């Protein structure tokens, strides 16, 4: 059915993994904010998923930096995968593609892993 479901994946130990729903809104928005200090471990590298996210607002684009901002502060590296080239668009217009990196996105959940594994290794 999902040959890139995240549980067909090796997902090396100090990465997490978090995979959005939909359209990258207020909805979202809530349920990501604040992921960061529920985590006890705090992972080394974190995925966000993006596959399924064809469009961002404002609420969602400010829960992104936020988020980025999060994981900064506690020596995270953010990766995201998925991100299709629509997507793309929207995030450099908003300026978020230079802030986090563009070797920091990818367009298939094979490439972020990839990256995270050597991440982790080094
Ligand atoms: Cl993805």
Redesign the pocket.
């Known amino acids: 059915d999902d040959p890139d479901a995240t549980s067909k994946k090796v997902v090396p130990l100090g990465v997490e993994i978090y995979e959005i729903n939909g359209p990258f809104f207020f909805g979202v928005a809530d349920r990501l904010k604040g992921v960061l200090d529920v985590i006890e471990e705090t992972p080394k590298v974190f995925i966000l998923?993006?596959?399924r996210v064809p469009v961002i607002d404002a609420t969602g684009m400010h829960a992104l930096w936020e988020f980025q901002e999060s994981c900064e502060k506690r020596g995270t590296i953010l990766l995201l995968?998925?991100v299709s080239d629509r997507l793309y668009g929207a995030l450099n217009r908003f300026g978020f593609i230079e802030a986090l990196g563009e070797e920091r996105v990818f367009d298939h959940?094979d490439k972020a892993l990839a990256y995270a594994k050597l991440l982790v290794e080094t």
């Open positions: 998923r993006m596959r995968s998925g959940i």
